[PDB]
Scaffold this active site. Structure first.
Site, PDB file in Angstrom:
ATOM      1  N   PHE A 173     -12.037  20.843  28.995  1.00  0.00           N
ATOM      2  CA  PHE A 173     -10.640  20.698  29.390  1.00  0.00           C
ATOM      3  C   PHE A 173      -9.834  19.990  28.305  1.00  0.00           C
ATOM      4  O   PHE A 173     -10.282  19.008  27.709  1.00  0.00           O
ATOM      5  CB  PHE A 173     -10.476  19.838  30.645  1.00  0.00           C
ATOM      6  CG  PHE A 173     -11.050  20.413  31.914  1.00  0.00           C
ATOM      7  CD1 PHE A 173     -12.401  20.269  32.221  1.00  0.00           C
ATOM      8  CD2 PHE A 173     -10.227  21.013  32.840  1.00  0.00           C
ATOM      9  CE1 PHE A 173     -12.901  20.776  33.412  1.00  0.00           C
ATOM     10  CE2 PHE A 173     -10.729  21.525  34.013  1.00  0.00           C
ATOM     11  CZ  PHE A 173     -12.075  21.413  34.294  1.00  0.00           C
TER      12      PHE A 173
ATOM     13  N   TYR B  61      -3.258  19.955  32.212  1.00  0.00           N
ATOM     14  CA  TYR B  61      -4.547  20.337  31.687  1.00  0.00           C
ATOM     15  C   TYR B  61      -4.624  21.844  31.536  1.00  0.00           C
ATOM     16  O   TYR B  61      -3.873  22.574  32.176  1.00  0.00           O
ATOM     17  CB  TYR B  61      -5.667  19.834  32.610  1.00  0.00           C
ATOM     18  CG  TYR B  61      -5.768  20.566  33.934  1.00  0.00           C
ATOM     19  CD1 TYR B  61      -4.994  20.211  35.019  1.00  0.00           C
ATOM     20  CD2 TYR B  61      -6.560  21.694  34.095  1.00  0.00           C
ATOM     21  CE1 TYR B  61      -5.034  20.906  36.211  1.00  0.00           C
ATOM     22  CE2 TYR B  61      -6.575  22.452  35.261  1.00  0.00           C
ATOM     23  CZ  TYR B  61      -5.806  22.049  36.329  1.00  0.00           C
ATOM     24  OH  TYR B  61      -5.775  22.743  37.514  1.00  0.00           O
TER      25      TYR B  61
ATOM     26  N   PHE C  45      -9.682  29.351  32.623  1.00  0.00           N
ATOM     27  CA  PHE C  45      -9.788  29.669  34.046  1.00  0.00           C
ATOM     28  C   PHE C  45      -8.627  29.080  34.845  1.00  0.00           C
ATOM     29  O   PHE C  45      -8.432  29.531  35.973  1.00  0.00           O
ATOM     30  CB  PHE C  45     -11.148  29.292  34.626  1.00  0.00           C
ATOM     31  CG  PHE C  45     -11.555  27.857  34.462  1.00  0.00           C
ATOM     32  CD1 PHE C  45     -11.016  26.824  35.236  1.00  0.00           C
ATOM     33  CD2 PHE C  45     -12.469  27.523  33.488  1.00  0.00           C
ATOM     34  CE1 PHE C  45     -11.382  25.502  35.025  1.00  0.00           C
ATOM     35  CE2 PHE C  45     -12.841  26.215  33.276  1.00  0.00           C
ATOM     36  CZ  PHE C  45     -12.283  25.192  34.037  1.00  0.00           C
ATOM     37  N   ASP C  46      -7.886  28.118  34.276  1.00  0.00           N
ATOM     38  CA  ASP C  46      -6.829  27.444  35.013  1.00  0.00           C
ATOM     39  C   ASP C  46      -6.042  26.547  34.082  1.00  0.00           C
ATOM     40  O   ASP C  46      -6.556  26.034  33.109  1.00  0.00           O
ATOM     41  CB  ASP C  46      -7.348  26.583  36.176  1.00  0.00           C
ATOM     42  CG  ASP C  46      -6.246  26.309  37.206  1.00  0.00           C
ATOM     43  OD1 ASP C  46      -5.427  27.237  37.427  1.00  0.00           O
ATOM     44  OD2 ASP C  46      -6.218  25.198  37.769  1.00  0.00           O
TER      45      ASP C  46
ATOM     46  N   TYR D 287     -19.615  21.668  38.434  1.00  0.00           N
ATOM     47  CA  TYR D 287     -20.004  22.417  39.625  1.00  0.00           C
ATOM     48  C   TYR D 287     -21.457  22.876  39.631  1.00  0.00           C
ATOM     49  O   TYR D 287     -21.812  23.631  40.532  1.00  0.00           O
ATOM     50  CB  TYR D 287     -19.003  23.551  39.820  1.00  0.00           C
ATOM     51  CG  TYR D 287     -17.565  23.108  40.007  1.00  0.00           C
ATOM     52  CD1 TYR D 287     -17.064  22.722  41.240  1.00  0.00           C
ATOM     53  CD2 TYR D 287     -16.695  23.017  38.915  1.00  0.00           C
ATOM     54  CE1 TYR D 287     -15.730  22.350  41.413  1.00  0.00           C
ATOM     55  CE2 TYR D 287     -15.359  22.669  39.070  1.00  0.00           C
ATOM     56  CZ  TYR D 287     -14.861  22.333  40.327  1.00  0.00           C
ATOM     57  OH  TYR D 287     -13.554  21.907  40.529  1.00  0.00           O
TER      58      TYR D 287
ATOM     59  N   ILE E 156     -13.879  16.574  40.005  1.00  0.00           N
ATOM     60  CA  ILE E 156     -15.266  16.526  39.555  1.00  0.00           C
ATOM     61  C   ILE E 156     -15.567  15.238  38.796  1.00  0.00           C
ATOM     62  O   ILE E 156     -14.671  14.571  38.261  1.00  0.00           O
ATOM     63  CB  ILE E 156     -15.643  17.780  38.740  1.00  0.00           C
ATOM     64  CG1 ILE E 156     -14.688  17.977  37.550  1.00  0.00           C
ATOM     65  CG2 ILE E 156     -15.740  19.008  39.649  1.00  0.00           C
ATOM     66  CD1 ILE E 156     -15.056  19.108  36.601  1.00  0.00           C
TER      67      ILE E 156
END
Ligand SMILES: C=C[C@H]1CN(Cc2ccccn2)C(=O)[C@@H]2CCC[C@H]1N2[S@](=N)(=O)c1cc(Cl)cc(Cl)c1
EC number: 5.2.1.8
Length: 107
Positions: free
Chosen positions: A99, A26, A36-37, A82, A56
């Site tokens: 994502f 991902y 972010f990742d 979140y 999540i």
């Protein structure tokens, strides 16, 4: 909630079932497109057990809609990610997350 949009189709037969280990690559982005990742950056697929809630809500509900091999975009409202707080050091308050997820295999 979570919206799932196909990028490229999967096998159209095999979906993640409760209790299976789901293995993906991902990239996670904020709604403005800032990454972010990514598991690709770690050169190591990400694994999670469906139903265990180690991820999540929008992943639990969203990735369950994917068939093996599929690449999709998941767009997740803050309440399925979140929330109002966000997550320290990584996710701002009230962040809608996007994502790119490729479902590699099930074990
Ligand atoms: C690196 C593992 C995951 C972290 N989690 C659960 C989680 C576990 C610990 C702290 C915060 N959230 C998650 O639910 C989601 C979806 C699965 C990929 C990734 N995240 S994430 N949104 O890319 C992510 C990635 C990173 Cl490096 C930190 C955070 Cl706070 C959140």
């Amino acid at each position: 909630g979570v919206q799932v949009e196909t990028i490229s189709p999967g096998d159209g037969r095999t979906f993640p079932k409760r209790g299976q280990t789901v293995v993906v690559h991902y990239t996670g982005m904020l709604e403005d497109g800032k990454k972010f990742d990514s598991s690709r950056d770690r050169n190591k697929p990400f694994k999670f057990m469906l139903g265990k809630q180690e991820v999540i809500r929008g992943w639990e509900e969203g990735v369950a809609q994917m068939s093996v091999g599929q690449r999709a975009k998941l767009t997740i409202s803050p309440d399925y990610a979140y929330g109002a707080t966000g997550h320290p050091g990584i996710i701002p308050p009230h962040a809608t997350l996007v994502f790119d997820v490729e479902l590699l295999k099930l074990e």
